[PDB]
Amino acid sequence: GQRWELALGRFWDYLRWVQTLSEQVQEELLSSQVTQELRALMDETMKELKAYKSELEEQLTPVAEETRARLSKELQAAQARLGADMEDVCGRLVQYRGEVQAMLGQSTEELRVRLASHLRKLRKRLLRDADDLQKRLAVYQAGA
């Protein structure tokens, strides 16, 4: 099932737009609008993913509790790793907003060079934990 993949696709596209640090992105960065819109997207992905795991617990093949429950603890953790990535990205954008206030009108060009470099790394990490969680979810899609 892929309702949570679509909701993550929307998170991921928005963040790809933020990564460009265009005029409008910078505007909405110094206000609380992109961390407010990324929270809403995160929240729909996690909502939809909790409900997909819930419905997959209905179509599980014959695995004994020390293995079927080893697997949900490993899957709740990949859900948790992905949530923690998205929160990390929003905290790095809050940090940028603060660091622009503290410049007191001075050039933020060197600040946007470090942000773009840092955001790319976070987004690299985010994408590999979504891929990992899809794998654990696909092995669980049938049981073990």
PDB file of N, CA, C and O in Angstrom, residues 56-115:
ATOM      1  N   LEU A  56      -1.543  -3.666   7.764  1.00  0.00           N
ATOM      2  CA  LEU A  56      -0.720  -4.817   7.421  1.00  0.00           C
ATOM      3  C   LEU A  56      -0.692  -5.866   8.526  1.00  0.00           C
ATOM      4  O   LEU A  56      -0.598  -7.040   8.220  1.00  0.00           O
ATOM      5  N   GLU A  57      -0.837  -5.518   9.812  1.00  0.00           N
ATOM      6  CA  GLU A  57      -1.011  -6.446  10.947  1.00  0.00           C
ATOM      7  C   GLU A  57      -2.230  -7.385  10.860  1.00  0.00           C
ATOM      8  O   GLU A  57      -2.440  -8.321  11.636  1.00  0.00           O
ATOM      9  N   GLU A  58      -3.069  -7.100   9.867  1.00  0.00           N
ATOM     10  CA  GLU A  58      -4.233  -7.900   9.482  1.00  0.00           C
ATOM     11  C   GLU A  58      -3.997  -9.017   8.437  1.00  0.00           C
ATOM     12  O   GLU A  58      -4.803  -9.932   8.235  1.00  0.00           O
ATOM     13  N   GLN A  59      -2.887  -8.937   7.707  1.00  0.00           N
ATOM     14  CA  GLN A  59      -2.506  -9.890   6.674  1.00  0.00           C
ATOM     15  C   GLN A  59      -1.077 -10.435   6.848  1.00  0.00           C
ATOM     16  O   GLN A  59      -0.235 -10.439   5.952  1.00  0.00           O
ATOM     17  N   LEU A  60      -0.812 -10.931   8.061  1.00  0.00           N
ATOM     18  CA  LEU A  60       0.489 -11.518   8.415  1.00  0.00           C
ATOM     19  C   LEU A  60       0.682 -13.052   8.292  1.00  0.00           C
ATOM     20  O   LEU A  60      -0.129 -13.832   8.822  1.00  0.00           O
ATOM     21  N   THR A  61       1.721 -13.567   7.603  1.00  0.00           N
ATOM     22  CA  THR A  61       1.953 -15.026   7.518  1.00  0.00           C
ATOM     23  C   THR A  61       2.510 -15.641   8.804  1.00  0.00           C
ATOM     24  O   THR A  61       3.154 -14.941   9.593  1.00  0.00           O
ATOM     25  N   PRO A  62       2.253 -16.939   9.078  1.00  0.00           N
ATOM     26  CA  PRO A  62       2.761 -17.702  10.221  1.00  0.00           C
ATOM     27  C   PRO A  62       4.145 -17.530  10.893  1.00  0.00           C
ATOM     28  O   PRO A  62       5.041 -18.386  10.870  1.00  0.00           O
ATOM     29  N   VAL A  63       4.353 -16.389  11.540  1.00  0.00           N
ATOM     30  CA  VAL A  63       5.563 -16.182  12.317  1.00  0.00           C
ATOM     31  C   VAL A  63       5.340 -16.124  13.836  1.00  0.00           C
ATOM     32  O   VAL A  63       4.444 -15.479  14.387  1.00  0.00           O
ATOM     33  N   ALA A  64       6.159 -16.913  14.525  1.00  0.00           N
ATOM     34  CA  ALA A  64       6.146 -17.002  15.983  1.00  0.00           C
ATOM     35  C   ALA A  64       6.471 -15.719  16.749  1.00  0.00           C
ATOM     36  O   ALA A  64       7.425 -15.042  16.370  1.00  0.00           O
ATOM     37  N   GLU A  65       5.783 -15.341  17.837  1.00  0.00           N
ATOM     38  CA  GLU A  65       6.062 -14.091  18.571  1.00  0.00           C
ATOM     39  C   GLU A  65       7.523 -13.611  18.754  1.00  0.00           C
ATOM     40  O   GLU A  65       7.752 -12.416  18.585  1.00  0.00           O
ATOM     41  N   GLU A  66       8.563 -14.425  19.016  1.00  0.00           N
ATOM     42  CA  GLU A  66       9.954 -13.922  19.101  1.00  0.00           C
ATOM     43  C   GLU A  66      10.557 -13.417  17.771  1.00  0.00           C
ATOM     44  O   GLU A  66      11.551 -12.685  17.748  1.00  0.00           O
ATOM     45  N   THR A  67       9.968 -13.826  16.631  1.00  0.00           N
ATOM     46  CA  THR A  67      10.273 -13.244  15.317  1.00  0.00           C
ATOM     47  C   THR A  67       9.197 -12.247  14.846  1.00  0.00           C
ATOM     48  O   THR A  67       9.604 -11.135  14.508  1.00  0.00           O
ATOM     49  N   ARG A  68       7.852 -12.433  14.836  1.00  0.00           N
ATOM     50  CA  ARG A  68       6.905 -11.369  14.401  1.00  0.00           C
ATOM     51  C   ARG A  68       6.971 -10.073  15.214  1.00  0.00           C
ATOM     52  O   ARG A  68       6.872  -8.963  14.675  1.00  0.00           O
ATOM     53  N   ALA A  69       7.192 -10.208  16.531  1.00  0.00           N
ATOM     54  CA  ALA A  69       7.396  -9.061  17.414  1.00  0.00           C
ATOM     55  C   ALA A  69       8.844  -8.494  17.460  1.00  0.00           C
ATOM     56  O   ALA A  69       9.070  -7.386  17.952  1.00  0.00           O
ATOM     57  N   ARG A  70       9.869  -9.204  16.933  1.00  0.00           N
ATOM     58  CA  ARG A  70      11.272  -8.727  16.748  1.00  0.00           C
ATOM     59  C   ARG A  70      11.203  -7.723  15.597  1.00  0.00           C
ATOM     60  O   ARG A  70      11.750  -6.617  15.606  1.00  0.00           O
ATOM     61  N   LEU A  71      10.464  -8.163  14.568  1.00  0.00           N
ATOM     62  CA  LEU A  71      10.179  -7.356  13.392  1.00  0.00           C
ATOM     63  C   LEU A  71       9.323  -6.107  13.616  1.00  0.00           C
ATOM     64  O   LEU A  71       9.673  -5.092  13.027  1.00  0.00           O
ATOM     65  N   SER A  72       8.237  -6.027  14.384  1.00  0.00           N
ATOM     66  CA  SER A  72       7.571  -4.747  14.629  1.00  0.00           C
ATOM     67  C   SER A  72       8.465  -3.801  15.441  1.00  0.00           C
ATOM     68  O   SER A  72       8.510  -2.623  15.135  1.00  0.00           O
ATOM     69  N   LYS A  73       9.224  -4.215  16.463  1.00  0.00           N
ATOM     70  CA  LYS A  73      10.204  -3.379  17.196  1.00  0.00           C
ATOM     71  C   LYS A  73      11.288  -2.766  16.265  1.00  0.00           C
ATOM     72  O   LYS A  73      11.687  -1.602  16.399  1.00  0.00           O
ATOM     73  N   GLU A  74      11.779  -3.535  15.279  1.00  0.00           N
ATOM     74  CA  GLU A  74      12.689  -3.038  14.246  1.00  0.00           C
ATOM     75  C   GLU A  74      12.009  -2.098  13.263  1.00  0.00           C
ATOM     76  O   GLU A  74      12.643  -1.169  12.763  1.00  0.00           O
ATOM     77  N   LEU A  75      10.723  -2.313  12.963  1.00  0.00           N
ATOM     78  CA  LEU A  75       9.925  -1.423  12.106  1.00  0.00           C
ATOM     79  C   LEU A  75       9.474  -0.169  12.832  1.00  0.00           C
ATOM     80  O   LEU A  75       9.378   0.893  12.236  1.00  0.00           O
ATOM     81  N   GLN A  76       9.162  -0.186  14.115  1.00  0.00           N
ATOM     82  CA  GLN A  76       8.724   1.021  14.811  1.00  0.00           C
ATOM     83  C   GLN A  76       9.937   1.955  14.880  1.00  0.00           C
ATOM     84  O   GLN A  76       9.825   3.153  14.695  1.00  0.00           O
ATOM     85  N   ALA A  77      11.140   1.374  14.969  1.00  0.00           N
ATOM     86  CA  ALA A  77      12.395   2.114  15.004  1.00  0.00           C
ATOM     87  C   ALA A  77      12.796   2.791  13.697  1.00  0.00           C
ATOM     88  O   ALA A  77      13.392   3.864  13.657  1.00  0.00           O
ATOM     89  N   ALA A  78      12.461   2.178  12.572  1.00  0.00           N
ATOM     90  CA  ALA A  78      12.681   2.796  11.279  1.00  0.00           C
ATOM     91  C   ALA A  78      11.618   3.878  11.053  1.00  0.00           C
ATOM     92  O   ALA A  78      11.840   4.839  10.325  1.00  0.00           O
ATOM     93  N   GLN A  79      10.398   3.726  11.581  1.00  0.00           N
ATOM     94  CA  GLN A  79       9.411   4.773  11.592  1.00  0.00           C
ATOM     95  C   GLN A  79       9.954   5.949  12.407  1.00  0.00           C
ATOM     96  O   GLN A  79       9.963   7.111  11.993  1.00  0.00           O
ATOM     97  N   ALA A  80      10.484   5.639  13.589  1.00  0.00           N
ATOM     98  CA  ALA A  80      11.079   6.604  14.504  1.00  0.00           C
ATOM     99  C   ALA A  80      12.296   7.276  13.898  1.00  0.00           C
ATOM    100  O   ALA A  80      12.334   8.496  13.956  1.00  0.00           O
ATOM    101  N   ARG A  81      13.272   6.573  13.315  1.00  0.00           N
ATOM    102  CA  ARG A  81      14.405   7.135  12.546  1.00  0.00           C
ATOM    103  C   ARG A  81      13.924   8.148  11.495  1.00  0.00           C
ATOM    104  O   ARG A  81      14.419   9.278  11.472  1.00  0.00           O
ATOM    105  N   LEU A  82      12.940   7.817  10.618  1.00  0.00           N
ATOM    106  CA  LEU A  82      12.359   8.732   9.605  1.00  0.00           C
ATOM    107  C   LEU A  82      11.711   9.975  10.225  1.00  0.00           C
ATOM    108  O   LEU A  82      11.931  11.091   9.746  1.00  0.00           O
ATOM    109  N   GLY A  83      10.922   9.845  11.309  1.00  0.00           N
ATOM    110  CA  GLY A  83      10.360  11.013  12.033  1.00  0.00           C
ATOM    111  C   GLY A  83      11.385  12.027  12.582  1.00  0.00           C
ATOM    112  O   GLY A  83      11.292  13.271  12.477  1.00  0.00           O
ATOM    113  N   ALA A  84      12.421  11.412  13.160  1.00  0.00           N
ATOM    114  CA  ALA A  84      13.595  12.106  13.676  1.00  0.00           C
ATOM    115  C   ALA A  84      14.455  12.820  12.614  1.00  0.00           C
ATOM    116  O   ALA A  84      15.067  13.846  12.906  1.00  0.00           O
ATOM    117  N   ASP A  85      14.498  12.343  11.367  1.00  0.00           N
ATOM    118  CA  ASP A  85      15.143  12.999  10.228  1.00  0.00           C
ATOM    119  C   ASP A  85      14.503  14.318   9.800  1.00  0.00           C
ATOM    120  O   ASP A  85      15.157  15.357   9.599  1.00  0.00           O
ATOM    121  N   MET A  86      13.192  14.214   9.635  1.00  0.00           N
ATOM    122  CA  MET A  86      12.266  15.309   9.298  1.00  0.00           C
ATOM    123  C   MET A  86      12.323  16.349  10.412  1.00  0.00           C
ATOM    124  O   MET A  86      12.611  17.503  10.131  1.00  0.00           O
ATOM    125  N   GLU A  87      12.134  16.029  11.705  1.00  0.00           N
ATOM    126  CA  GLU A  87      12.365  16.971  12.789  1.00  0.00           C
ATOM    127  C   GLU A  87      13.762  17.586  12.739  1.00  0.00           C
ATOM    128  O   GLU A  87      13.885  18.789  12.920  1.00  0.00           O
ATOM    129  N   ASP A  88      14.848  16.864  12.447  1.00  0.00           N
ATOM    130  CA  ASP A  88      16.214  17.403  12.261  1.00  0.00           C
ATOM    131  C   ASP A  88      16.398  18.503  11.183  1.00  0.00           C
ATOM    132  O   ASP A  88      17.120  19.477  11.349  1.00  0.00           O
ATOM    133  N   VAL A  89      15.798  18.289  10.013  1.00  0.00           N
ATOM    134  CA  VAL A  89      15.670  19.232   8.944  1.00  0.00           C
ATOM    135  C   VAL A  89      14.947  20.472   9.445  1.00  0.00           C
ATOM    136  O   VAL A  89      15.471  21.572   9.240  1.00  0.00           O
ATOM    137  N   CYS A  90      13.754  20.401  10.057  1.00  0.00           N
ATOM    138  CA  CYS A  90      13.093  21.614  10.608  1.00  0.00           C
ATOM    139  C   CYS A  90      13.923  22.365  11.678  1.00  0.00           C
ATOM    140  O   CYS A  90      14.041  23.583  11.676  1.00  0.00           O
ATOM    141  N   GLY A  91      14.603  21.711  12.596  1.00  0.00           N
ATOM    142  CA  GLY A  91      15.531  22.358  13.483  1.00  0.00           C
ATOM    143  C   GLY A  91      16.728  23.041  12.866  1.00  0.00           C
ATOM    144  O   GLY A  91      17.247  23.998  13.443  1.00  0.00           O
ATOM    145  N   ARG A  92      17.221  22.566  11.715  1.00  0.00           N
ATOM    146  CA  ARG A  92      18.314  23.213  10.968  1.00  0.00           C
ATOM    147  C   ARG A  92      17.782  24.437  10.244  1.00  0.00           C
ATOM    148  O   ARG A  92      18.416  25.460  10.138  1.00  0.00           O
ATOM    149  N   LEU A  93      16.562  24.435   9.778  1.00  0.00           N
ATOM    150  CA  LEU A  93      15.947  25.641   9.247  1.00  0.00           C
ATOM    151  C   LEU A  93      15.585  26.693  10.340  1.00  0.00           C
ATOM    152  O   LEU A  93      15.572  27.914  10.132  1.00  0.00           O
ATOM    153  N   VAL A  94      15.270  26.301  11.568  1.00  0.00           N
ATOM    154  CA  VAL A  94      15.044  27.221  12.677  1.00  0.00           C
ATOM    155  C   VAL A  94      16.373  27.875  13.062  1.00  0.00           C
ATOM    156  O   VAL A  94      16.500  29.097  13.263  1.00  0.00           O
ATOM    157  N   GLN A  95      17.414  27.041  13.083  1.00  0.00           N
ATOM    158  CA  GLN A  95      18.739  27.546  13.250  1.00  0.00           C
ATOM    159  C   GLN A  95      19.142  28.580  12.180  1.00  0.00           C
ATOM    160  O   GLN A  95      19.759  29.604  12.474  1.00  0.00           O
ATOM    161  N   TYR A  96      18.832  28.364  10.913  1.00  0.00           N
ATOM    162  CA  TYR A  96      19.139  29.337   9.894  1.00  0.00           C
ATOM    163  C   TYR A  96      18.403  30.650  10.149  1.00  0.00           C
ATOM    164  O   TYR A  96      19.028  31.705  10.100  1.00  0.00           O
ATOM    165  N   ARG A  97      17.110  30.608  10.455  1.00  0.00           N
ATOM    166  CA  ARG A  97      16.315  31.802  10.707  1.00  0.00           C
ATOM    167  C   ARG A  97      16.872  32.693  11.831  1.00  0.00           C
ATOM    168  O   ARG A  97      17.066  33.904  11.716  1.00  0.00           O
ATOM    169  N   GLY A  98      17.269  32.029  12.909  1.00  0.00           N
ATOM    170  CA  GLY A  98      17.919  32.662  14.050  1.00  0.00           C
ATOM    171  C   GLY A  98      19.263  33.266  13.687  1.00  0.00           C
ATOM    172  O   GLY A  98      19.580  34.414  13.995  1.00  0.00           O
ATOM    173  N   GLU A  99      20.089  32.513  12.981  1.00  0.00           N
ATOM    174  CA  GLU A  99      21.377  32.988  12.521  1.00  0.00           C
ATOM    175  C   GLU A  99      21.266  34.169  11.554  1.00  0.00           C
ATOM    176  O   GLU A  99      22.229  34.923  11.450  1.00  0.00           O
ATOM    177  N   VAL A 100      20.145  34.343  10.820  1.00  0.00           N
ATOM    178  CA  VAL A 100      19.904  35.489   9.957  1.00  0.00           C
ATOM    179  C   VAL A 100      19.511  36.632  10.854  1.00  0.00           C
ATOM    180  O   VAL A 100      19.956  37.743  10.550  1.00  0.00           O
ATOM    181  N   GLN A 101      18.699  36.476  11.925  1.00  0.00           N
ATOM    182  CA  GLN A 101      18.412  37.605  12.847  1.00  0.00           C
ATOM    183  C   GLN A 101      19.655  38.195  13.527  1.00  0.00           C
ATOM    184  O   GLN A 101      19.877  39.381  13.573  1.00  0.00           O
ATOM    185  N   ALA A 102      20.577  37.342  13.919  1.00  0.00           N
ATOM    186  CA  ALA A 102      21.800  37.668  14.595  1.00  0.00           C
ATOM    187  C   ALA A 102      22.876  38.356  13.783  1.00  0.00           C
ATOM    188  O   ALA A 102      23.845  38.875  14.337  1.00  0.00           O
ATOM    189  N   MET A 103      22.697  38.359  12.460  1.00  0.00           N
ATOM    190  CA  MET A 103      23.545  39.084  11.501  1.00  0.00           C
ATOM    191  C   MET A 103      23.200  40.582  11.394  1.00  0.00           C
ATOM    192  O   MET A 103      23.950  41.445  10.947  1.00  0.00           O
ATOM    193  N   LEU A 104      22.012  40.896  11.840  1.00  0.00           N
ATOM    194  CA  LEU A 104      21.529  42.253  11.929  1.00  0.00           C
ATOM    195  C   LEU A 104      21.556  43.057  10.640  1.00  0.00           C
ATOM    196  O   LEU A 104      21.978  44.219  10.518  1.00  0.00           O
ATOM    197  N   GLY A 105      21.086  42.345   9.621  1.00  0.00           N
ATOM    198  CA  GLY A 105      20.938  42.886   8.268  1.00  0.00           C
ATOM    199  C   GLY A 105      22.077  42.635   7.276  1.00  0.00           C
ATOM    200  O   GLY A 105      21.917  42.890   6.073  1.00  0.00           O
ATOM    201  N   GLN A 106      23.235  42.206   7.812  1.00  0.00           N
ATOM    202  CA  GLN A 106      24.433  41.840   7.070  1.00  0.00           C
ATOM    203  C   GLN A 106      24.191  40.692   6.059  1.00  0.00           C
ATOM    204  O   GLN A 106      23.187  39.971   6.097  1.00  0.00           O
ATOM    205  N   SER A 107      25.084  40.545   5.087  1.00  0.00           N
ATOM    206  CA  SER A 107      25.048  39.509   4.061  1.00  0.00           C
ATOM    207  C   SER A 107      24.836  38.074   4.562  1.00  0.00           C
ATOM    208  O   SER A 107      25.557  37.510   5.392  1.00  0.00           O
ATOM    209  N   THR A 108      23.793  37.407   4.080  1.00  0.00           N
ATOM    210  CA  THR A 108      23.558  36.040   4.505  1.00  0.00           C
ATOM    211  C   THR A 108      23.980  35.063   3.446  1.00  0.00           C
ATOM    212  O   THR A 108      23.777  33.870   3.573  1.00  0.00           O
ATOM    213  N   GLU A 109      24.717  35.507   2.432  1.00  0.00           N
ATOM    214  CA  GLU A 109      25.217  34.651   1.365  1.00  0.00           C
ATOM    215  C   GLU A 109      26.062  33.445   1.823  1.00  0.00           C
ATOM    216  O   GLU A 109      25.826  32.306   1.414  1.00  0.00           O
ATOM    217  N   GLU A 110      27.027  33.666   2.719  1.00  0.00           N
ATOM    218  CA  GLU A 110      27.870  32.627   3.299  1.00  0.00           C
ATOM    219  C   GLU A 110      26.946  31.733   4.137  1.00  0.00           C
ATOM    220  O   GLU A 110      27.104  30.513   4.187  1.00  0.00           O
ATOM    221  N   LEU A 111      25.903  32.274   4.780  1.00  0.00           N
ATOM    222  CA  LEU A 111      24.938  31.424   5.490  1.00  0.00           C
ATOM    223  C   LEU A 111      24.128  30.473   4.637  1.00  0.00           C
ATOM    224  O   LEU A 111      23.964  29.332   5.045  1.00  0.00           O
ATOM    225  N   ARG A 112      23.626  30.905   3.496  1.00  0.00           N
ATOM    226  CA  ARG A 112      22.945  30.066   2.532  1.00  0.00           C
ATOM    227  C   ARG A 112      23.897  29.090   1.875  1.00  0.00           C
ATOM    228  O   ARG A 112      23.468  28.000   1.551  1.00  0.00           O
ATOM    229  N   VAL A 113      25.189  29.317   1.726  1.00  0.00           N
ATOM    230  CA  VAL A 113      26.079  28.281   1.187  1.00  0.00           C
ATOM    231  C   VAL A 113      26.214  27.083   2.136  1.00  0.00           C
ATOM    232  O   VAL A 113      26.018  25.928   1.749  1.00  0.00           O
ATOM    233  N   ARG A 114      26.460  27.311   3.420  1.00  0.00           N
ATOM    234  CA  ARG A 114      26.457  26.273   4.475  1.00  0.00           C
ATOM    235  C   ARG A 114      25.135  25.584   4.714  1.00  0.00           C
ATOM    236  O   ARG A 114      25.073  24.390   4.912  1.00  0.00           O
ATOM    237  N   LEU A 115      24.012  26.258   4.592  1.00  0.00           N
ATOM    238  CA  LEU A 115      22.698  25.648   4.727  1.00  0.00           C
ATOM    239  C   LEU A 115      22.387  24.609   3.651  1.00  0.00           C
ATOM    240  O   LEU A 115      21.847  23.541   3.916  1.00  0.00           O
TER     241      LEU A 115
END
